[PDB]
């Protein structure tokens, strides 16, 4: 909604001048840093979101999907003040929003985590390689840049089109933690950008991740029911912790 | 004290012969200005097709071993970049041989002040003190038509207080810091002009010897830009491009950069290593690294496209990287960078800064090749200047670029070993001056050579002051490997940060021979400049204890 472009007006204020244990803008020194480490990824605290006003906490755990990419943009509006430039780097910085509780484990989950951005933990388990999703579409001409998808695609061209890497990794939940009697149910985890290549097998790990879904996805043939899949596309990545 | 022209046309009339000449004409020593200087020279004698004989001398001891040895039918002689210190009359000594004597020695110099002994009493020169100072240099003047050739008991105490009247501020002269004036080459091509000779290669060997010496000073190089760029003016391959053309194709004005090998190596490492910015930018502090890439990241350049080799940069990078810098280096002090600088372009090749070509050159120098084993490495020295003469030719460039990859290389020894050093903070603050030693430090074969040791100098006189409040200080510095506790301690200069009010004139060429007259400990200025001496580590210590004490500055 264009009421939400309005939260944007709040949120960068969030996202500069706010300051924490007796002045020196934290978010100020992680623009700096990436800024020069320029690894793209912004990182913003729950815990200072959630203390300047819940009503925003709120939204994280109600529909974090459209409001990371208001918020990202943002982001890249403050970047681009403070440094005049990165329209040559990388032109879209997805923010990796630290610690979510919840803290909802693996084998507790609903349908009331669909769409709601939750944290995950657990043991990796081996790891696909690293293959290049379509993402953004763009050609020459010749109808114009088609956005596909997360993940759908329907309903191919290429000239210049901007890949970023895809990997699948499926966690399993920690053998430690393991009520007597129950075997270790496990979730798909997809991971984006620079999150790949950040886990390894053996390896506990923290995820924000939100739960999705599509598509049936497929079974139709031994379910009996209209059954999804589980996938949680991910957001950030912590060791243990 | 002569007409260029007319010394030019003596050097003429002694010269053609049969068998003839004969003349040498020594080029010395490891400064890259007597390259510049005895090629443009060279060429001007093959011009005329007059034969010569071309010594590369490397130790001021070492020039007696020559003179004395090897000369029977040569009565022109020619020398380059010694003698404005010590006379080589007494030093060689001449014994006058037939006035209108026989031989003339031609010396070159650069430095100064002039010997005494050497403008005044004509005898193996034929000074090339002009036009410099001139000046007057009326001390010199009173040196000596007062001095020679000197009731009567006041007149004879009247008489010797006059003498020592003159003593005095004669006293005052000679002893004095080693500071040049111009570049020999810039003299050489003053002479050249005047016989009529515009040649291109040789105006580029004129560029290549003003910008010998920037590393260190200017110090009126500041004011030669008009004598040159007037001269680029003088010329031109043609009105417009009409690109490129293969020939024709020469040297151009470009804003230049004290940044190290922009064109022949990658950015970031450019940066990174350059000499000026390693001081303001605290490079050597991981603290002060990052500011690096907060520049970067102030240009919007990748730290991915930073990292490439300068040739494959993007295109739109290149056509701002004379703008970005404007619009950036400017908020980090780092303003004073972009000179008007003279680059010569190949063509198909590539193209060459001025500077950079002249870090090529100094790379060849010490690499890419009990006395006994120091004469056969000065004589590894001696080849290896061929080696470095080489790559001034046009005609062999694949040779020129075994220089850069060597350049390169020595500056990330002499980086690395840099920052080896102020880690431990091994600065000496004491109390008149400055004063350092390596002890210890990897591969110090790369330190041997003097030169070596006046960038590494440079670089770390550089580096500790910005300024950096107070007081330059001129830097000591010392290293060993071999040839038994050799420890070669050069002298150094102070730096001021583009703004140079004095010339401050090194003092330490008169504080060596002071102790040289003392108890002369195992000190050695075998190498042929006033600033660089040897010393045993068994007599170092006493050698620095007698260097802090007394302080002439």
């Known amino acids: 909604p264009n009421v939400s472009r309005t939260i944007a007006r709040e949120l960068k204020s969030f996202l500069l001048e706010y300051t924490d244990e007796t002045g020196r803008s934290v978010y100020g020194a992680r623009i700096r840093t990436l800024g020069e480490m320029n690894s793209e990824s912004l990182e913003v605290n729950y815990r200072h979101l959630a203390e300047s006003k819940a009503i925003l906490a709120l939204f994280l755990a109600k529909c974090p999907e459209e409001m990371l990419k208001i918020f990202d943009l943002v982001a890249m509006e403050a970047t681009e003040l403070h440094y005049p430039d990165y329209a040559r780097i990388h032109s879209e910085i997805h923010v990796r929003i630290s610690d979510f509780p919840t803290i909802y484990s693996l084998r507790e989950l609903r349908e009331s985590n669909l769409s709601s951005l939750v944290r995950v933990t657990g043991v990796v388990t081996r790891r696909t390689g690293v293959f290049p999703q379509l993402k953004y579409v763009k050609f020459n001409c010749l109808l114009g840049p088609f956005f596909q998808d997360s993940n759908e695609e329907i309903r191919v061209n290429g000239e210049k089109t901007v890949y970023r890497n895809y990997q699948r990794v499926t966690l399993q939940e920690a053998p430690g933690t393991v009520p007597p009697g129950r075997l270790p149910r496990h979730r798909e985890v997809i991971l984006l950008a620079d999150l790949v290549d950040v886990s390894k097998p053996g390896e506990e790990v923290e995820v924000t991740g939100i739960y999705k879904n599509n598509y049936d996805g497929n079974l139709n043939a031994k379910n009996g029911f209209p059954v999804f899949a589980t996938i949680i596309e991910a957001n950030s990545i912590k060791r243990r912790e | 004290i002569s007409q260029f022209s007319e010394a030019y046309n003596k050097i003429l009339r002694n010269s053609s012969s049969h068998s003839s000449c004969q003349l040498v004409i020594f080029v010395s020593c490891l400064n890259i200005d007597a390259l510049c200087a005895t090629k443009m020279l060279s060429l ?31 009565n022109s002689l020619l020398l380059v970049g010694f003698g404005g210190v010590i006379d080589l009359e007494a030093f060689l000594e001449i014994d006058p041989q037939e006035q209108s004597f026989r031989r003339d020695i031609y010396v070159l110099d650069a430095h100064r002040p002039w010997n005494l002994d050497n403008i005044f009493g004509s005898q193996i020169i034929q000074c090339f003190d002009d036009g410099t100072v001139d000046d007057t240099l009326g001390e010199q003047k009173e040196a000596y038509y007062k001095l020679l050739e000197l009731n009567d008991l006041s007149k004879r105490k009247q008489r010797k207080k006059q003498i020592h009247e003159y003593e005095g501020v004669l006293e005052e002269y000679y002893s004095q810091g080693t500071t040049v004036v111009n570049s020999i080459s810039a003299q050489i091509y003053s002479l050249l002009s005047a016989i009529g000779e515009t040649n ?31 001269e680029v003016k003088r010329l031109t391959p043609s009105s417009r491009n009409s690109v490129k053309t293969p020939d024709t194709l020469t ?26 910015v390693n001081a303001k930018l605290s490079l050597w502090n991981e603290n002060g690294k990052k500011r690096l890439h907060k520049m970067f990241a102030r240009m919007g350049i990748p730290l ?21 810098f404007d619009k950036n280096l400017d908020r980090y002090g780092l303003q004073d960078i972009i000179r008007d600088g003279f680059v010569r372009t190949l063509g198909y090749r590539g193209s060459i800064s ?12 010490e690499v890419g090749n009990s006395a006994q084993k120091l004469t056969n490495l000065r004589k590894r020295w001696v080849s290896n200047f061929w080696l470095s003469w080489d790559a001034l030719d046009d005609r062999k460039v694949e040779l020129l670029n075994r220089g850069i990859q060597l350049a390169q290389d020595l500056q990330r020894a002499i980086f690395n070993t840099g920052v080896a050093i102020l880690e431990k903070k091994l600065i000496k603050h ?47 510095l010392a290293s060993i490997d071999e040839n038994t506790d050799t420890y070669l301690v050069a002298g150094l200069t102070p730096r001021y940060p583009r703004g140079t009010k004095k010339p401050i004139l090194n003092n330490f060429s008169m504080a060596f021979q002071q102790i040289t007259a003392e108890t002369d400990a195992k000190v050695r200025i075998d190498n042929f400049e006033s600033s660089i001496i040897e010393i045993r580590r068994e007599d170092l210590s006493p050698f620095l204890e007698k260097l802090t004490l007394s302080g002439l500055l």
């Open chain 2, 44 to 74: 001007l004698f093959k011009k005329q097709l007059v034969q010569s004989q071309i010594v590369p001398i490397f130790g001021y001891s070492e020039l007696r071993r020559h003179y004395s040895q090897l000369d029977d039918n040569i």
């Open chain 2, 304 to 324: 991915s496209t930073a990292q490439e080799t300068w040739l494959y940069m993007d295109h739109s990078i290149k056509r701002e990287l004379g703008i970005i």
């Open chain 2, 200 to 230: 291109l290669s040789n105006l580029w060997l004129n560029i290549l010897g003003t910008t010998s010496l920037d590393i260190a000073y200017a110090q009126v190089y500041n004011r030669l830009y008009p004598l040159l760029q007037d």
């Open chain 2, 251 to 276: 040297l151009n004005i470009q804003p230049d950069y004290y940044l190290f090998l922009l064109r022949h190596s990658s950015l970031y490492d450019s940066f990174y290593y350059s000499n000026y």
């Open chain 2, 430 to 476: 004491l109390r008149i001056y400055r004063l350092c030693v390596l002890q210890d430090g990897p591969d110090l074969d790369l330190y041997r050579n003097p030169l070596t040791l006046l960038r590494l100098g440079n670089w770390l006189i550089e580096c500790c002051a910005e300024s950096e409040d107070k007081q330059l200080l001129p830097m000591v």
């Open chain 2, 354 to 365: 001025a500077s950079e070509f002249v870090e090529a050159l100094t790379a060849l120098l």
